[PDB]
Amino acid sequence: LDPVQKLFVDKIREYRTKRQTSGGPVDAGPEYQQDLDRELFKLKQMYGKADMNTFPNFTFEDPKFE
Amino acid sequence: AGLVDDFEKKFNALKVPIPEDKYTAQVDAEEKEDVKSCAEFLTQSKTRIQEYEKELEKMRN
């Protein structure tokens, strides 16, 4: 993604060492998981709430006439 | 994922009624009251109108 090869050897392989594992991507990291669960629900609260894996179909209405 | 796709077809597929009537006696609550408006009061009103016109003839003598 970026450069220097001895330092980046330490890091760029460590980009993908994380990705070079995917059940806990050499660490998902319990803290990451915990705060993730916090923000993911809290995000949900900060969102609109009508389930995000469901289609909001239509509604119908009838306007004032005298 | 597949949410957007599911939604895609389903949204592109999802359809809508069009909002009800209430009060459309007007089309009718017209024409009958319209017969009162026009014809019934009209004709009577012309019948009035004529007598004065005939009598303004008379008053022209």
UniProtKB/Swiss-Prot annotation, chain A:
GO biological process, one term: proton motive force-driven ATP synthesis
Domain of life: Eukaryota
PTM-bearing positions, type N6-succinyllysine: 49, 64
Cellular location(s): Mitochondrion; Mitochondrion inner membrane
Keyword Plastid: no
Residue numbers carrying N6-acetyllysine: 6, 11, 44, 49, 64
GO molecular function: proton transmembrane transporter activity
First-listed, main subcellular location of the protein, grouped into a coarse class: mitochondrion
Gene Ontology terms: cellular component: mitochondrial inner membrane; mitochondrion; proton-transporting ATP synthase complex
Keywords (A to Z) from UniProt: Acetylation, CF(0), Hydrogen ion transport, Ion transport, Membrane, Mitochondrion, Mitochondrion inner membrane, Phosphoprotein, Transit peptide, Transport
Functional summary from the UniProt entry: Subunit F6, of the mitochondrial membrane ATP synthase complex (F(1)F(0) ATP synthase or Complex V) that produces ATP from ADP in the presence of a proton gradient across the membrane which is generated by electron transport complexes of the respiratory chain. ATP synthase complex consist of a soluble F(1) head domain - the catalytic core - and a membrane F(1) domain - the membrane proton channel. These two domains are linked by a central stalk rotating inside the F(1) region and a stationary peripheral stalk.
Family indicated by similarity: Belongs to the eukaryotic ATPase subunit F6 family.
Quaternary context: Component of the ATP synthase complex composed at least of ATP5F1A/subunit alpha, ATP5F1B/subunit beta, ATP5MC1/subunit c (homooctomer), MT-ATP6/subunit a, MT-ATP8/subunit 8, ATP5ME/subunit e, ATP5MF/subunit f, ATP5MG/subunit g, ATP5MK/subunit k, ATP5MJ/subunit j, ATP5F1C/subunit gamma, ATP5F1D/subunit delta, ATP5F1E/subunit epsilon, ATP5PF/subunit F6, ATP5PB/subunit b, ATP5PD/subunit d, ATP5PO/subunit OSCP.
Name of the protein this chain belongs to: ATP synthase peripheral stalk subunit F6, mitochondrial
Record gene name: ATP5PF
Residues represented out of the complete protein: 36 to 101 of 108
From Swiss-Prot, chain B:
Residue positions where N6-succinyllysine is found in the record: 15, 22, 32
Residue positions where N6-acetyllysine is found in the record: 9, 15, 22, 32, 54
Keyword Mitochondrion tagged: yes
Cellular compartment(s): Mitochondrion; Mitochondrion inner membrane
Molecular function GO terms recorded: proton-transporting ATP synthase activity, rotational mechanism
Keywords: Acetylation, CF(0), Hydrogen ion transport, Ion transport, Membrane, Mitochondrion, Mitochondrion inner membrane, Transport
Broad class of where this protein is predominantly found: mitochondrion
Cellular component terms (Gene Ontology): mitochondrial inner membrane; mitochondrion; proton-transporting ATP synthase complex
Function: Subunit d, of the mitochondrial membrane ATP synthase complex (F(1)F(0) ATP synthase or Complex V) that produces ATP from ADP in the presence of a proton gradient across the membrane which is generated by electron transport complexes of the respiratory chain. ATP synthase complex consist of a soluble F(1) head domain - the catalytic core - and a membrane F(1) domain - the membrane proton channel. These two domains are linked by a central stalk rotating inside the F(1) region and a stationary peripheral stalk.
Quaternary structure, from the entry: Component of the ATP synthase complex composed at least of ATP5F1A/subunit alpha, ATP5F1B/subunit beta, ATP5MC1/subunit c (homooctomer), MT-ATP6/subunit a, MT-ATP8/subunit 8, ATP5ME/subunit e, ATP5MF/subunit f, ATP5MG/subunit g, ATP5MK/subunit k, ATP5MJ/subunit j, ATP5F1C/subunit gamma, ATP5F1D/subunit delta, ATP5F1E/subunit epsilon, ATP5PF/subunit F6, ATP5PB/subunit b, ATP5PD/subunit d, ATP5PO/subunit OSCP.
Entry protein name: ATP synthase peripheral stalk subunit d, mitochondrial
First-to-last residue of the parent protein present: 64 to 124 of 161
